[PDB]
């Protein structure tokens, strides 16, 4: 597919056996999911962007499904607004930034 | 072109006549730009990202050439760690993301 970017690229994702929104995001190296209770071993981590830090659960070799596209990979759950699709598995769906 | 996501997707920019680096950031409704000096009028305003809110200075309809493209619009300069170049300049240069 294409996704112009008039919108926010929103699409759903399957991640714990749970559909949710989440943003296709070029800007982002890693995928950070809105806190969730993932199974499993984690690591603390902090991550950072515009505004500072977040504490975040590292998760490692989660299954997501993006649009219909199988992912796995590492996922950071935290206090994020908005789920994002960071880079991590962005390349794992083949997507690109075309203009 | 057709940008791959295996690294950041960091292009050439020209604002205020000056080069910088910044990035293609699909999840960024705004663009967000290091502080500088630039020509034009601005108005104080508020963005927030991952790490909470932030002051900028809005300028208003700004020439920037993105990796050789053409845009006019607004650009947030603050104390963002990475000239982020968001939405509202990407669809001015008619990009889309694909998969
Ligand atoms: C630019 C602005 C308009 C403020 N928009 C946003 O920031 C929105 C905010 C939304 C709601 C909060 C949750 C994030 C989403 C997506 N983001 C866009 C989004 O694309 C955002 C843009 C960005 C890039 C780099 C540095 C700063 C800001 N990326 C990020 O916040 C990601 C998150 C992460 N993966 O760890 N940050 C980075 O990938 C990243 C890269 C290098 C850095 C160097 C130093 C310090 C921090 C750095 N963070």
């Known amino acids: 597919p294409q996704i112009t970017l008039w919108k926010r690229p ?3 994702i399957k991640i714990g056996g749970q559909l949710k929104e989440a943003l296709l ?3 982002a190296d890693d ?3 809105e806190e969730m209770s993932l199974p499993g071993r984690w690591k603390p981590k ?3 962007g515009i505004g500072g830090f977040i504490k975040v659960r590292q998760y490692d070799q989660i299954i997501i499904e993006i649009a ?3 992912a796995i990979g590492t996922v950071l759950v935290g ?7 960071g880079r991590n598995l962005l390349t794992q769906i083949g997507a690109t930034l075309n203009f």
């Open 68 to 70: 219909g596209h199988k």
């Open 46 to 48: 902090m991550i950072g």
């Open 10 to 12: 929103l699409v759903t």
């Open 79 to 85: 206090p994020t607004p908005v789920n994002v699709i």
């Open 31 to 33: 995928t950070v999911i």
């Open 25 to 27: 995001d070029t800007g």
